[PDB]
C-alpha cells in the first residue's frame, strides 16, 4: 500500500502497476480474496466498556454520594458507607445496563444501513461495502458519495469534494486527475470525505489504518456525545433540590446542636438525610428513559444518530419534507418532449435503460432523423455527469433520466465525442448548468456550449430558438407557448427541464423541453393523512415549479383544493415578521433554494414550532442541519444527507416518523412520575426529622433506616417508574411544549398532599407507640415499617398521574412489581433477621401490627385515587 504523498507524486500508470489495479475491469474474485487474506477488511480495528462504566461515576450527584460515603469512612460508620456505596452501585449499574442495551440495538440497526460504495471488480459494476475494499480496487465516485478509502483518481470530469470533516475548511476543493509534483493533494481523494459534485474514478491506495487521515475518524468514534438539553436541565434541577435539602439539613443541624442532642447521631442522621434527598436517580432515570425510547424507535426501524432527537420528537408538529427523494420515489424518467419547433414526442419505457422508443407522430425516431429532438437529446446527454453502468445509475436521478433517454434514442455515444474544457456546474441557487465543448473529430468548429436547467433561468440566457432547423430570434409568442406547455406539463406532474445550445453564454438557442415523471412514493399518502389526523402539519419545500409541486401535493393530500402556495422569490421579498405570520398557512413552497428552505425552517422555529425536515440531495444538507430534526432516507439516501441527518428511516417510510413521534411523547410523563415519587417521599422524611428535632421527640427513623428508604426511593422501586409503559391517552395529547416545566404546580400540589398524608400517619403511629414514655425498639420498627409501606403505596400511586391504578393492573409494570416485592422482602428481613434487627435497631412485630400498618398505608393510595377521579370528572 502506497502513502498518499507517494501516490500523489507517482503518475497513474506507476500506481496502477504497484497495486496491480486493472483500471477498466478491476480486481477479480480470486485477487480480492487473496488480498483480503493479508490486508483484511477496511474496518478501523475495534472501538471502552470499563471506561463507559466509570464515566457514569463522574456525575455531580454520584460525586456527592461518594463524598458522603467518604465522610462516613473518615468519621467511621461502616454500615452507612456500605449502604451509600450499594445505592451508588445499583443506580449506576441500571444506567449502564440500559445504555449498553440501547447502544447495541443502535449498532444492530446501523448494520442494516452500512457504509457502501460503487466498485467495478469482475468487469461488472456492483454496490459493495467499503468494508470489503482491498488495495488496488477500482472505485467510482458519484455526486453525494462518501469516499470509501484513499483513492488515486485517474478520472475527474468534474469533482468538488468537501474537506470539512478532515481539513477544517468548509469550501469544497476541486480535484485534478493529473499528477502533482512533490491537504494540497489535488488528485488524491481521502477516505470518508463527501463528493459535492461531478463524477470520478480512482484506485484505492489503502485499507484499514493505512488511510492518511484515519486518526480523525478514530477520534470521532471516541468523541462521545454532549449531554442532552433535558439531561442538563435535570442535572440543574437535581442540584437545586439537593441544595435546598442541604439547607434544610443545615437547619436541622443547628436546631439539634442548640437544643441539645448527641452530635454524632445528629451527623449520621443528617448524612443519611442528605444522601436521601439528593436525587441520584434523576439523571439516571432520564438516561434510562432516553435509552428505552431509542430502543422503541429502533424497533420501529429508525436509526437515531443523535440522542437529543429523543427529547425533541415529542414536540414535533411541522414536517418540511422535500418533493424529490423524500415524498417521491426518485425513480425519474423522461416521458414527454416538446420541441422548440412545436413538434411533440412521447417517450416510452421506464427505468434507467436504453430499452424504450421515442414516438413522434406515431413514427419511431433514431439517430439524427428529427434534428430538433436529436439536438434536445444531445444537449441532454452531453451536459450531465451521470453514467448508467450495467443498469445502475450513479449520478443524479434527473441526469440519469436524460442519459436513459439518450441511450433510448441511440445518441449516448456523443458523450464521448466532446471535450469539456469549461464547465459551469449545477447549483441549487443557479438552477441551471452549462458546459463548453469542442467536437473531437472536428476541432475546427467553435466552442459549442450546451445548457440545461429550469425554464425561467434557461430562457433568460437564450436569445434565439430553432424553427425547422433554422436559428431565429426568440419572440414573446414563442415564450408564451413554451410557458403554457411548461405549466401544463407540471400540472400533469411531469418535472420540466429546459435545454439549449449555442456559442457562448447569453447567445444560446432554445431547443425544447423534457417532461420527467417522478411518481410519488408509495404509502406516503396514508402517512400524510395519519399525520394531519394526528395534529401534525406537513409542508412541501422544493426548488421545482409551482405546477409540479402542487400537482404532486394534491395527489398526496397535503395540498387541498383551497390551499396557499408561495414562491421563493416572494419569501425573499417578504420581511421576517410577515413571513412568520404567513408560513403556517402555506402548504407548498416552490422554487425555494436552500437559502429559502433555511429561511422557512427558521421562521417555523421562530413560531415556537419543532421542525422535522425530511430532505434529500447534496445542497439540502445545510437545511437538514438547520432543522431541529433532520431525517434521511435509508435505501434511497445519499451519504451526504445520512451523514448530515439526525435520524435515518431504514425502511424508507413516512409512518416511521409518526411512530418515532409517538415513542418520543411519554418520556416526559415517566420522568415526572419519578420526580413526584422521589420528591414526595424525600419531603416526607425531611419533615418528619424536622418535627422530631424541633419538638425534641426522639427521631422516628435512624440513619440506616433512612439509607434503606433512600435505596427504595432511588433504587429499583423508583427507577421502575421510568420503565412504566405509556398509555394511549398521552399520545392523543397535542405536542409537548419545548419548555421542560417538569415541576408543574399540580405536580407540586400532589407532592405536598402525599407528603402531608405520609407525615400525618407516621407521626400518628409514632405518638401512639410513644404514649407510654418508653422509647422501645418496637416503636422504631413500627414507625419505620409505616414509612416504608407508605413509600410503596406512594410509588403505586406515582405509576400514573391521571390514569387510575386499577385499570392499569398490578402486573402491567413487571419491573415495578419485582422492585416492590423485593422492597417488602427486605423490610420483612430487616424486621426479623436478628443481625439486621441489631444493625437497624428493630424488634419483631406481630401479624396484627402488620395488618394495621397495611390498612393505614392504604390511605395514601386511596386519597391519590380519589384525587385522580376528581380531576377526571372535572376535565370531562
Amino acid at each position, epitope marked *: 500500500v502506497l502513502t498518499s504523498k507517494k501516490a500523489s507524486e507517482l503518475p497513474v500508470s506507476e500506481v496502477a502497476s504497484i497495486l496491480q489495479a486493472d483500471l477498466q475491469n478491476g480486481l477479480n474474485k480470486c485477487e480480492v480474496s487473496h488480498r483480503r487474506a493479508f490486508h483484511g477488511w477496511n474496518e478501523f480495528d475495534i472501538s471502552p466498556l470499563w471506561k463507559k462504566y466509570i464515566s457514569q461515576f463522574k456525575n455531580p450527584l454520584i460525586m456527592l454520594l461518594l463524598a458522603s460515603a467518604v465522610i462516613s469512612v473518615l468519621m467511621h460508620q461502616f454500615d452507612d458507607a456500605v449502604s451509600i456505596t450499594v445505592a451508588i452501585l445499583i443506580v449506576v449499574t441500571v444506567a449502564f445496563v440500559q445504555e449498553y442495551r440501547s447502544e447495541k440495538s443502535l449498532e444492530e440497526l446501523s448494520k442494516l444501513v452500512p457504509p457502501e460504495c460503487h466498485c467495478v471488480r469482475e468487469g461488472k459494476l456492483e454496490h459493495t461495502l467499503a468494508r470489503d475494499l482491498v488495495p488496488g480496487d477500482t472505485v467510482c465516485l458519484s455526486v453525494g458519495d462518501r469516499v470509501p478509502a484513499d483513492l488515486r483518481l485517474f478520472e475527474a470530469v468534474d469533482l468538488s469534494i468537501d474537506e470539512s470533516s478532515l481539513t477544517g475548511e468548509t469550501t469544497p476543493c476541486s480535484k485534478v486527475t493529473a499528477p502533482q509534483p512533490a491537504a494540497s493533494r489535488s488528485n488524491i481523494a481521502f477516505m470518508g470525505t463527501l463528493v459535492r459534485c461531478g463524477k470520478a474514478k480512482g484506485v484505492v491506495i489503502g485499507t484499514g489504518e493505512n488511510s492518511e487521515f484515519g486518526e480523525v475518524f478514530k477520534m470521532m468514534q471516541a468523541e462521545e456525545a454532549p449531554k442532552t438539553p433535558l439531561q442538563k436541565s435535570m442535572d440543574l434541577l437535581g442540584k437545586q433540590l439537593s441544595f435546598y435539602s442541604f439547607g434544610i439539613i443545615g437547619i436541622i443541624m443547628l436546631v439539634g446542636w442548640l437544643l441539645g442532642k448527641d452530635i454524632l447521631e445528629m451527623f449520621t442522621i443528617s448524612v443519611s438525610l442528605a444522601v436521601a434527598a439528593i436525587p441520584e436517580g434523576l439523571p439516571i432515570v432520564v438516561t434510562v428513559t432516553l435509552a428505552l425510547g431509542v430502543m422503541r424507535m429502533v424497533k420501529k426501524r429508525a436509526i437515531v444518530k443523535k440522542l437529543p432527537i429523543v427529547e425533541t420528537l415529542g414536540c414535533c408538529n411541522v414536517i418540511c419534507s422535500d418533493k424529490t427523494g423524500t415524498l417521491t420515489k426518485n425513480e425519474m424518467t423522461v416521458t414527454h418532449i416538446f420541441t422548440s419547433d412545436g413538434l411533440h414526442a412521447e417517450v416510452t*419505457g421506464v*427505468g434507467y*435503460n436504453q430499452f424504450g422508443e421515442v414516438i413522434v407522430d406515431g413514427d419511431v425516431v433514431h439517430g439524427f432523423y428529427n434534428p430538433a429532438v436529436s439536438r434536445i437529446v444531445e444537449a441532454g446527454c452531453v451536459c450531465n455527469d451521470a453514467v448508467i453502468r450495467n443498469n445502475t445509475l450513479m449520478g443524479k436521478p434527473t441526469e440519469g433520466a436524460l442519459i436513459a433517454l439518450a441511450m433510448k434514442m441511440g445518441l449516448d455515444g456523443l458523450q464521448q465525442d466532446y471535450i469539456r474544457k469549461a464547465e459551469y456546474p449545477f447549483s441549487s441557487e443557479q438552477k441551471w448548468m452549462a458546459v463548453k465543448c469542442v467536437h473531437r473529430t472536428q476541432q475546427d468548429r467553435p466552442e459549442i456550449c450546451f445548457m440545461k436547467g429550469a425554464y425561467e433561468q434557461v430562457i433568460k440566457y437564450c436569445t434565439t430558438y430553432q424553427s425547422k432547423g433554422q436559428t431565429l430570434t426568440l419572440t414573446q409568442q414563442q415564450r408564451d407557448v413554451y410557458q403554457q406547455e411548461k405549466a*401544463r406539463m407540471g400540472s400533469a406532474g411531469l418535472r420540466v427541464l429546459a435545454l439549449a445550445s449555442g456559442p457562448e453564454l447569453g447567445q444560446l438557442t432554445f431547443l425544447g423541453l423534457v417532461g420527467i415523471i417522478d411518481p410519488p412514493r408509495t404509502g406516503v399518502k396514508e402517512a400524510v393523512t395519519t399525520l394531519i389526523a394526528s395534529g401534525v402539519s406537513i409542508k412541501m419545500i422544493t426548488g421545482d415549479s409551482q405546477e409540479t409541486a402542487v400537482a404532486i401535493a394534491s395527489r398526496l393530500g397535503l395540498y387541498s383544493k383551497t390551499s396557499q402556495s408561495v414562491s421563493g422569490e416572494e419569501i425573499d421579498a417578504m420581511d421576517v415578521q410577515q413571513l412568520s405570520q404567513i408560513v403556517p398557512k402555506v402548504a407548498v413552497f416552490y422554487r425555494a433554494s436552500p437559502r429559502h428552505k433555511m429561511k422557512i425552517i427558521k421562521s417555523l422555529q421562530k413560531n415556537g414550532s419543532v421542525v422535522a425536515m425530511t430532505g434529500d440531495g447534496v445542497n439540502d444538507a445545510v437545511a437538514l442541519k438547520a432543522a431541529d430534526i433532520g431525517v434521511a432516507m435509508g435505501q434511497t439516501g445519499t451519504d451526504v444527507c445520512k451523514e448530515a441527518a439526525d435520524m435515518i428511516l431504514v425502511d424508507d417510510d413516512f409512518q416511521t416518523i409518526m411512530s418515532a413521534i409517538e415513542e418520543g411523547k411519554g418520556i416526559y410523563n415517566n420522568i415526572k412520575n419519578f420526580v413526584r415519587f422521589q420528591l414526595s417521599t424525600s419531603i416526607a422524611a425531611l419533615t418528619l426529622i424536622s418535627l422530631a428535632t424541633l419538638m425534641n421527640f426522639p427521631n422516628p427513623l435512624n440513619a440506616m433506616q433512612i439509607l434503606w428508604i433512600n435505596i427504595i426511593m432511588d433504587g429499583p422501586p423508583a427507577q421502575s417508574l421510568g420503565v412504566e409503559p405509556v398509555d394511549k391517552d398521552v399520545i392523543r395529547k397535542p405536542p409537548r411544549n419545548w419548555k421542560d416545566s417538569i415541576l408543574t404546580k399540580n405536580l407540586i400540589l400532589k407532592i405536598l398532599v402525599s407528603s402531608i398524608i405520609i407525615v400525618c400517619g407516621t407521626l400518628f403511629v409514632f405518638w401512639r407507640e410513644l404514649r407510654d414514655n418508653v422509647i422501645t425498639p418496637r416503636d422504631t420498627t413500627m414507625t419505620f415499617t409505616c414509612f416504608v409501606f407508605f413509600d410503596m403505596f406512594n410509588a403505586l400511586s406515582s405509576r400514573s398521574q391521571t390514569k387510575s391504578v386499577f385499570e392499569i393492573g398490578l402486573c402491567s409494570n413487571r419491573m415495578f412489581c419485582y422492585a416492590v416485592l423485593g422492597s417488602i422482602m427486605g423490610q420483612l428481613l430487616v424486621i426479623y433477621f436478628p443481625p439486621l434487627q441489631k444493625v437497624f435497631q428493630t424488634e419483631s412485630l406481630s401479624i396484627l401490627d402488620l395488618l394495621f400498618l397495611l390498612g393505614l398505608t392504604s390511605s395514601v393510595c386511596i386519597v391519590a385515587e380519589i384525587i385522580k377521579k376528581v380531576e377526571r370528572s372535572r376535565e370531562k
Partner: nanobody
Amino acid sequence: QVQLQESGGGLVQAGGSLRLSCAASGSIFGADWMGWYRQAPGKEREFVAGIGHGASTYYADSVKGRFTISRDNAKNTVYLQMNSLKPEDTAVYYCAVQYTQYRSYDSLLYWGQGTQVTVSS
C-alpha cells in the same frame, strides 16, 4: 380503462422451462410499448423483455437468447417463455403497458400486480 392481470408464476428448477402470461381487459393493439420488468430485493427493477411499435422485440442483455415474448390479439394476452433459468436470475416479475398519446400530458402507464418466481440451487 384497461386492467392488467399476471399469471403462471411458480417454483421452478434450474434447467427447466417456465411460462408467464399478462392479460389485459382490452385488446392488445394500440400499445406501442409493453414489457416485463424484473424487480428483486436489494436492487432496482430491471427490464425483462418487450415489444415496440414496429414489431421489433427488445430483450435485456442478461437474459438475451433465452427469453421469448409473443403477443396475439385473439387471446389478448401477452405470453412469455423462459428456458435455461439460473438461481441468480430469479425475482418478482411485473408486466407493464403504455399506450400512445394531442393536448394532455398524463402518462398512460399501467402496471400488473406481479407474480413471484423463486429458484433454488
